[PDB]
Design a protein around this ligand. Structure first.
Ligand SMILES: *Cc1c(COP(=O)(O)O)cnc(C)c1O
Ligand SMILES: *Cc1c(COP(=O)(O)O)cnc(C)c1O
Lengths: 396, 396
């Protein structure tokens, strides 16, 4: 049965993990996968989280099945984070959320949902973008088309190119938007641009699909949801896949959600029934632990206070690191100007390096980054900043 | 987009959960989903588990991504449980295990794996069987065929019928076997029958696929794996999906595994690469919590000792309950003889009731069971045994 099977191609991002574990050199600087590191170069578990886990260990009495869509309180809390405490979608019961195994799991159940219950044949994704989007949608049978987005030689959102390419999108097809902290460019549209996109979308008949994996890492919780809420205010239907992996540092606990929005509750319920079917035929119900932690925190005023401050400190350390990065580079005498880095939202640095420069970086200097020239700034720390910059200056 | 979508059909088993939550009557006896209940009618979290969670809360320092196949130690431990501490499959490195979100998640990744990388067009499942098997395999695109298994008017394994129907299975197609505690008949083949099936299988060219969700609930850990090891000893390739939901009572933490076995390590590795691809396009990596708990317990002598005893007490309470069930029935004057119940392995009672009798049970008496006439004996307790039996005697 398995004699003819061929080796699968390695993942451009997740594959870095395996490359790293095979390298014996001690001074390896890992700036690949987008995980947050503190000043000591460790990706720690939040205090609010530890406190919640303490509470769960003491108050949890059963481990019984969670119900297809997961913890109800968890879903309600996520809707408020996404649409605002007094949103119309929430009041008119137009939204239904399913707890899922991470944001990726959400993209998968959405894709399966779309493929079997809708006439969507193709999904539109940006370029530059996130590799996993194409894999996920192609595996569900949907065709993936790319739209223009980044202005390389200027380092800004090529808004005219964005609309010109999107003119190709027909009514009925899906358009994938990054909520905030665009992976990998870090450049997001402004509120006015979001509004333009929203009106153009409603008018053109596209089914919007938001991938929200970095809420709170750009400006803040509420501000980062601005674009989404703009679309939510004009749209009748939409899908939003969110993740709590990064803003709660619950990476391996696979905590995410998939929210469906329809014209009314009758439609959303009828639709959600089919999304539950897609889920039940996959993993049945979702892992409780991570979601319980989030609900506990999000539901306790004291805990939420600690958590938001921790989120603030993470965003602040990254902002400090990129400003320090640019500085140490000029300090080391980099021939190219990387000041544009400071305008990027999120955890990454994108735009300066080529496929070969990053290859040389890992080979000669043991610095690991993605082949697209994307570096995880959150992996940068005061102690690795100098060696890291010396490596980069030698490769420019 | 979502106007034409139709309401999905409810799940025959998981749907019971929703039926129950809508019934306001106080004396509802839930004997539907196969979850263990103690004397007090609660499905509690094991002490060994609580101890492990305590240890994790204190020793866990990061929540960083788990790697596609999950916790290595967890996989190794599961291989020993399944194939025995000194198995050849383990020594010759012929087996590769991936941590998955429950046993259902394992069946799904196996189905996706098969559909895209193999020429398997159909999977053979028993009748009576577990409804989810058909859903899972059909959603991956594979066709599901059923084979004879149970002798209703005798309450035994119809072994001749089993082989006669399986003669229809061609070389290349999958045959699904329940490791032990056959859901729902509770009747498993004997070691000699397992051996016959093993030889017939190798000779006929079927790819065996074991669903191991109740190890330890029939006779014991080692004894329950006898059939599997018989096949493992004669087979070159095989797949085994196991669950820790029941034997560890970690239901909502989604703890399972998918193990692939090939002729040698070269083949199994090449094959596993594609299974990792199927996983990465689904949920990326699995939830850490539940698997960590199992690895902690399974890896600590003291903890394992406590855990095995708890598993023993669960099996013993269920055995006591079915003997008490049969007795109270005759005590109440049931016209039909249900003594065959005592020969059933696992958590269920199957064979006495009809679709209408169970319907009347939930309607008139508020007793919930699956429409197939399958009752969760583990849900039976000294306090609900009497009312439960009175309901049944009134419906016979
Ligand atoms: C991280 C990320 C996700 C989701 O990650 P999960 O670990 O699966 O929660 C989705 N989209 C983008 C762009 C991401 O960066
Ligand atoms: C319980 C069960 C499974 C797996 O359950 P999970 O909660 O998904 O681990 C698989 N097969 C059968 C027959 C079962 O009873």
């Amino acid at each position: 049965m398995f004699e003819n099977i061929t080796t699968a191609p390695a993942d451009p991002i997740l594959g870095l993990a395996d490359l790293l574990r095979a390298d014996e050199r001690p001074g390896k600087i890992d700036l690949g996968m987008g995980v947050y590191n503190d000043e000591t170069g460790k990706t720690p578990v939040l205090t609010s989280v530890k406190k919640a886990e303490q509470y769960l260990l003491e108050n949890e009495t059963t481990k019984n099945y969670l119900g297809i869509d997961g913890i109800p309180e968890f879903g309600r809390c996520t809707q408020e984070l996404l649409f605002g405490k007094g949103s119309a979608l929430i009041n008119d019961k137009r939204a239904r959320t399913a707890q899922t195994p991470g944001g990726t799991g959400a993209l998968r159940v959405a894709a399966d949902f779309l493929a079997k219950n809708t006439s969507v044949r193709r999904v539109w994704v940006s370029n530059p973008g996130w590799p996993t989007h194409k894999s996920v949608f192609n595996s569900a049978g949907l065709e993936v088309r790319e739209y223009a987005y980044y202005d390389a030689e200027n380092h800004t959102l090529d808004f005219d190119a964005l609309i010109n390419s999107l003119n190709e999108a027909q009514a009925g097809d899906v358009v994938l938007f990054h909520g905030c902290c665009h992976n990998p460019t870090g450049i997001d549209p402004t509120l006015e641009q979001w509004q333009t996109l929203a009106q153009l979308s409603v008018e053109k008949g596209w089914l919007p699909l938001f991938d929200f994996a970095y809420q709170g890492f750009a400006r803040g919780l509420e501000e980062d949801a601005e674009g989404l809420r703009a679309f939510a205010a004009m749209h009748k239907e939409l899908i939003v896949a969110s993740s709590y992996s990064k803003n709660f540092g619950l990476y391996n606990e696979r905590v995410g959600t998939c929210t469906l929005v329809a014209a009314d509750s009758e439609t959303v319920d009828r639709a959600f029934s089919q999304m539950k079917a897609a889920i039940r035929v996959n993993y049945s119900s979702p892992p409780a632990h991570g979601a319980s932690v989030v609900a506990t925190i999000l539901g306790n005023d004291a805990l939420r206070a600690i958590w938001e401050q921790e989120l603030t400190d993470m965003r602040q350390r990254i902002q400090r690191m990129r400003q320090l990065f640019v500085n140490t580079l000029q300090e080391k005498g980099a021939n190219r100007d990387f000041s544009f880095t400071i305008k990027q939202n999120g955890m990454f640095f994108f735009g300066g390096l080529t496929k070969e420069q990053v290859l040389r970086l890992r080979e000669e200097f043991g610095v690991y980054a993605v082949a697209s020239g994307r570096l995880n700034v959150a992996g940068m720390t005061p102690d690795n900043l100098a060696p890291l910059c010396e490596a980069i200056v030698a490769v420019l």
